[PDB]
Amino acid sequence: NQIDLNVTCRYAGVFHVEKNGRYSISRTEAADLCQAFNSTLPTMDQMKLALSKGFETCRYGFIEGNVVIPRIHPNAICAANHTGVYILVTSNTSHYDTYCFNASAPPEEDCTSVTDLPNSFDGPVTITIVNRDGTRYSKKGEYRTHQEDI
Ligand SMILES: O=C(N[C@@H]1CCCNC1)c1ccccc1
């Protein structure tokens, strides 16, 4: 009973979370997952400021109201070579990664590791936070509040 959460650097408190190495998070699960990180889905403004501080990914993830990819460098296989906060317009499907925003994080680039899931609750799942540098933090718990996500 395991969940792997790959996380990134935080940029102005915004970071990316990929669950189990594939697009697998619903919008309801994304809100609960960010809440477990004492975080919320970023607003478009928060994500734009994170982008300006150096944040980019090559993965679709939820923010408040939209599914986006923050891009700094044009890359043909990432958001069709666009720069800026690329907004997903047309998709058949509902599961993506998520972005989260933690207000207590540093104001600019914070590429230290994530070392806790501070607001997870009691539960049976071994949840492992996996940093980009491979460092891991594991705890037993749960963060999903909607049955349809379990
Ligand atoms: O673990 C986190 N931050 C660490 C704290 C110690 C120093 N470096 C980052 C964290 C938790 C929840 C959301 C975002 C980040």
Short mmCIF file of C-alpha atoms and ligand atoms in Angstrom, two decimals:
data_model
loop_
_atom_site.label_atom_id
_atom_site.label_comp_id
_atom_site.label_asym_id
_atom_site.label_seq_id
_atom_site.Cartn_x
_atom_site.Cartn_y
_atom_site.Cartn_z
CA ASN A 1 0.00 0.00 0.00
CA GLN A 2 2.32 2.72 -1.30
CA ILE A 3 2.19 6.11 -2.95
CA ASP A 4 5.32 7.83 -4.37
CA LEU A 5 5.21 11.62 -4.65
CA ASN A 6 7.95 13.09 -6.79
CA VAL A 7 8.42 16.75 -5.84
CA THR A 8 10.48 19.63 -7.19
CA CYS A 9 12.21 22.81 -5.98
CA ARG A 10 9.82 25.45 -4.77
CA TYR A 11 9.79 28.74 -6.68
CA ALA A 12 8.02 31.52 -4.76
CA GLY A 13 6.37 28.60 -2.84
CA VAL A 14 5.11 26.81 -5.94
CA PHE A 15 6.23 23.26 -6.65
CA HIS A 16 5.26 20.30 -8.82
CA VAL A 17 4.06 16.93 -7.54
CA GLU A 18 3.82 13.79 -9.68
CA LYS A 19 2.11 10.76 -8.19
CA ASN A 20 3.40 7.27 -8.94
CA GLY A 21 5.44 8.30 -11.95
CA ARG A 22 2.47 8.99 -14.19
CA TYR A 23 -0.44 11.45 -14.71
CA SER A 24 -2.71 10.07 -12.00
CA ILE A 25 -4.24 12.81 -9.91
CA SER A 26 -7.82 13.99 -10.19
CA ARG A 27 -8.76 17.64 -9.39
CA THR A 28 -10.24 16.52 -6.03
CA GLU A 29 -7.17 14.47 -5.13
CA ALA A 30 -4.92 17.37 -6.13
CA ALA A 31 -6.61 19.71 -3.64
CA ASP A 32 -6.27 17.11 -0.86
CA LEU A 33 -2.65 16.34 -1.78
CA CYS A 34 -1.65 20.01 -1.62
CA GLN A 35 -3.49 20.29 1.71
CA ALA A 36 -1.30 17.43 3.03
CA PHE A 37 1.72 19.61 2.13
CA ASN A 38 0.05 22.58 4.09
CA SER A 39 -0.40 24.01 0.61
CA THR A 40 -3.09 24.95 -1.87
CA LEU A 41 -3.53 24.79 -5.64
CA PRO A 42 -1.63 27.84 -6.91
CA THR A 43 -3.52 30.72 -8.40
CA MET A 44 -2.53 31.75 -11.93
CA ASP A 45 -0.82 34.85 -10.42
CA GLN A 46 1.18 32.71 -7.96
CA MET A 47 2.24 30.39 -10.79
CA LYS A 48 3.24 33.35 -13.01
CA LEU A 49 5.46 34.72 -10.22
CA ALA A 50 6.99 31.24 -9.68
CA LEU A 51 7.71 31.09 -13.44
CA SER A 52 9.47 34.50 -13.23
CA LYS A 53 11.76 33.15 -10.46
CA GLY A 54 12.89 30.19 -12.62
CA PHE A 55 10.15 27.55 -12.44
CA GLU A 56 9.54 25.30 -15.38
CA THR A 57 8.39 21.72 -15.89
CA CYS A 58 7.49 19.54 -18.84
CA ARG A 59 4.30 18.16 -17.18
CA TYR A 60 0.66 19.12 -17.08
CA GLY A 61 -0.54 19.85 -13.62
CA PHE A 62 -3.48 21.49 -11.88
CA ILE A 63 -3.50 25.01 -10.62
CA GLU A 64 -6.70 26.80 -9.45
CA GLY A 65 -9.08 26.80 -12.47
CA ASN A 66 -6.73 25.33 -15.09
CA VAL A 67 -4.22 22.63 -16.05
CA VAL A 68 -0.91 24.26 -17.07
CA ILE A 69 2.77 23.77 -17.87
CA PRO A 70 5.12 26.61 -16.78
CA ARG A 71 7.76 27.07 -19.50
CA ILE A 72 10.83 29.26 -19.61
CA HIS A 73 12.78 27.67 -22.49
CA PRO A 74 11.01 26.78 -25.74
CA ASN A 75 11.19 23.00 -26.15
CA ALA A 76 9.24 21.23 -28.98
CA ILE A 77 8.13 18.33 -26.74
CA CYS A 78 7.06 20.59 -23.80
CA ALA A 79 3.84 22.60 -24.26
CA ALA A 80 4.41 22.68 -28.04
CA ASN A 81 7.48 25.02 -27.83
CA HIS A 82 5.54 27.73 -25.94
CA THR A 83 6.96 29.88 -23.15
CA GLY A 84 5.07 31.34 -20.21
CA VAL A 85 2.34 29.55 -18.30
CA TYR A 86 0.97 27.29 -21.01
CA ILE A 87 -2.68 26.54 -20.48
CA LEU A 88 -4.09 23.17 -21.56
CA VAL A 89 -7.15 23.91 -23.71
CA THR A 90 -8.33 20.61 -25.18
CA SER A 91 -8.05 17.22 -23.59
CA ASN A 92 -10.37 14.23 -23.34
CA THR A 93 -8.97 13.19 -19.95
CA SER A 94 -9.12 14.30 -16.33
CA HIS A 95 -5.94 13.06 -14.56
CA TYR A 96 -2.76 15.10 -14.41
CA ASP A 97 0.03 15.93 -11.96
CA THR A 98 -0.47 18.87 -9.60
CA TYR A 99 1.19 22.06 -8.59
CA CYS A 100 0.99 23.18 -4.98
CA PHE A 101 1.72 26.51 -3.29
CA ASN A 102 3.13 26.76 0.23
CA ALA A 103 3.06 30.33 1.59
CA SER A 104 5.82 29.69 4.16
CA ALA A 105 8.42 28.65 1.55
CA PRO A 106 11.21 31.11 0.56
CA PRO A 107 10.29 33.94 -1.85
CA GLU A 108 12.47 32.84 -4.76
CA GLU A 109 14.23 29.59 -5.81
CA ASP A 110 14.34 27.01 -3.04
CA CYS A 111 16.04 23.87 -4.30
CA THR A 112 16.49 22.28 -0.90
CA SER A 113 14.60 19.01 -0.49
CA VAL A 114 11.04 18.52 0.79
CA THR A 115 11.43 16.68 4.10
CA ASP A 116 7.85 16.28 5.39
CA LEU A 117 4.16 15.91 4.45
CA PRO A 118 3.13 17.96 7.49
CA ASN A 119 -0.62 17.83 7.21
CA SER A 120 -1.21 14.19 6.17
CA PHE A 121 -3.66 12.38 8.39
CA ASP A 122 -3.80 8.94 10.00
CA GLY A 123 -4.05 6.11 7.52
CA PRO A 124 -2.62 2.90 6.15
CA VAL A 125 -0.61 4.13 3.15
CA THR A 126 3.19 4.33 3.08
CA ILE A 127 3.59 7.72 1.39
CA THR A 128 7.07 8.50 0.13
CA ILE A 129 8.17 11.93 -0.91
CA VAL A 130 10.85 11.56 -3.56
CA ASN A 131 13.08 14.53 -4.25
CA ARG A 132 14.81 15.20 -7.57
CA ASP A 133 18.14 14.37 -5.92
CA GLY A 134 16.68 10.99 -4.85
CA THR A 135 16.40 11.82 -1.15
CA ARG A 136 13.33 10.33 0.40
CA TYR A 137 10.98 10.96 3.30
CA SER A 138 8.37 8.33 4.10
CA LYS A 139 5.45 8.34 6.48
CA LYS A 140 2.39 6.21 7.04
CA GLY A 141 -0.87 8.04 6.50
CA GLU A 142 -3.46 9.20 4.06
CA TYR A 143 -4.40 12.51 2.43
CA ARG A 144 -7.40 11.52 0.22
CA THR A 145 -10.77 12.61 1.52
CA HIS A 146 -12.92 11.61 -1.50
CA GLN A 147 -13.75 7.87 -1.80
CA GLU A 148 -13.73 8.03 -5.64
CA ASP A 149 -9.98 8.87 -5.43
CA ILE A 150 -9.08 5.73 -3.41
O1 LIG B 1 9.58 20.04 3.45
C1 LIG B 1 9.32 21.14 3.07
N1 LIG B 1 10.26 22.21 3.15
C2 LIG B 1 11.55 21.91 3.67
C3 LIG B 1 11.69 22.39 5.08
C4 LIG B 1 13.10 22.37 5.54
C5 LIG B 1 14.03 23.14 4.60
N2 LIG B 1 13.82 22.86 3.15
C6 LIG B 1 12.44 22.66 2.67
C7 LIG B 1 7.98 21.49 2.44
C8 LIG B 1 6.83 20.97 3.01
C9 LIG B 1 5.64 21.33 2.42
C10 LIG B 1 5.61 22.14 1.28
C11 LIG B 1 6.76 22.66 0.72
C12 LIG B 1 7.96 22.31 1.33
#
